[PDB]
Structure 1
Amino acid sequence: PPATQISDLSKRKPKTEDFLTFLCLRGSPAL
């Protein structure tokens, strides 16, 4: 389960306080 495309997009367009944390707050950059 290498993340999800919708989750990656939501980690792409917002990258601020309203980032929903979760796996996006985890090691999303650099795989």
Structure 2
Amino acid sequence: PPATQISDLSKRKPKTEDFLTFLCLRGSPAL
């Protein structure tokens, strides 16, 4: 349950140094 879908999924389009840290910078693509 990674809370809001956006913060855990829509980080795939910005897959570089533009994720603004948050859960996107953490292991969001992986488990």
Q: TM-score, normalised on structure 1? A: 0.51
Aligned-residue sequence identity (percent) comes to 100
Greater RCO (Cα-Cα under 8 Å, separation 6 or more):
2
* Cα gap change, 1:27 to 1:9, in 2 (>3 Å): closer
Shift in Å at residue 23 of structure 1? 0.6
Choose 6-15 or 17-26, whichever is displaced more. Answer: 6-15
Structure 1 stretches (4+) deviating beyond 4 angstroms? none
Unaligned runs of 5+ residues in structure 2 are: none
Q: TM-score, normalised on structure 2? A: 0.51
Unaligned runs of 5+ residues in structure 1 are: none
